[PDB]
Design a protein around this ligand. Sequence first.
Ligand SMILES: O=S([O-])[O-]
Ligand SMILES: O=S([O-])[O-]
Lengths: 226, 226
Amino acid sequence: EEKKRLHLIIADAELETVPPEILDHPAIVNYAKRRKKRPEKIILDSTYHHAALRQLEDGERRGRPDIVHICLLNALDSILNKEDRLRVYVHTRNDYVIYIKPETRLPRNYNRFIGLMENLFEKGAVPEDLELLRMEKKTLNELIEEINPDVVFIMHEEGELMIPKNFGKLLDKFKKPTVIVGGFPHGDFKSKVDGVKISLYREPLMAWTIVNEVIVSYEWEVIKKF
Amino acid sequence: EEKKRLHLIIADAELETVPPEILDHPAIVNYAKRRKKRPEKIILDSTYHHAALRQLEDGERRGRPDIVHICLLNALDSILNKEDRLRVYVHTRNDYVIYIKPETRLPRNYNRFIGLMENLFEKGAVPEDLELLRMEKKTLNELIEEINPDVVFIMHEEGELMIPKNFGKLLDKFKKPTVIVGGFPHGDFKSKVDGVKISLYREPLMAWTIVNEVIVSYEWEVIKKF
Ligand SMILES: O=S([O-])[O-]
Ligand SMILES: O=S([O-])[O-]
């Protein structure tokens, strides 16, 4: 744990269980009933729960765990991860952090991945001995503190523009660079932290695109074989 | 349509509706019943339909449309696509091809994406005027013929090894390079076609990883701005 790795935080993620406010909205009960599960245990998924988000704060961007799924399948199956050059983290829109042991194989199927998330929030670490996934109350600065990185990059549409190629060459110049990708469909970050704001393109991109640009550009810089 | 683009075929994809053989397996009926849908219209998804695949040929690798979903979200939201430098295609394990108009926004949520696939197989092109997705009976060579490419690359674990960086520099040396990524969890290709066999890493990678390596490496070569 002295080699150059990328610490990659999927921040302000729209990954949460059903909000208390709407546990008794019809759509939440009818869904909870069909799925034979206590509503407060269920992961909020706008695709099913839209009719219950109409009146909720930030309701239109919330309950998009899909974004996380695709970002993790991207990160964890990366060559970069296979070479032991990536720690990936998830910080949620409710200031919970998820630590992810590199060797973790996420479910390829979305609905198994959701099943896993429901577990993780219930038990707090899964599975029981291994704790490949572990979750606890934590702000993003508290998390950044733990990492103790020598640079922080905030992937943001309004940042200093870079060719992806070049960002990679930049990340290689540090020992423990953190990069923060928003885990949310649209809008600005909620957590404001210190960090360098970087745009990799002009028009806005989705989290996973950002993830894949960032990881590959480092890969060809940090992986010596390349 | 004279500029350098990458023609990217997701081949031999485990995307099909329920096979005729198992339309009357309990698990298929109970699922079809709950989802109030005629079994033969449903997209085969092993995560739900495993108990019905035990005795089916190739049953253990079949019904993984997830792999396609993640590969398309990767491809279509790529910068490469935004710059009009990518045609993406899907050829299935049942010799059907899906043409995908670049501007297409795939559902981010897996289960909406499945809904769309059920549609596409039913109506044959969706939506009705736009036909952003269009599907017809077609082998892979028949498809490769239509493309009329000046080189064919087959992403394969047992191929000539390349640094991804370098493959990109290679793809740029052609006008209309096709690259073929297997749309299946494991095993060898079913369709055998002419093409150069390329491995980007040693240990095996998932389709999307391959897709993301391939697209980004071309991006930094073909996109002049980069
Ligand atoms: O990872 S499992 O969902 O195929
Ligand atoms: O693309 S829709 O499923 O969010």
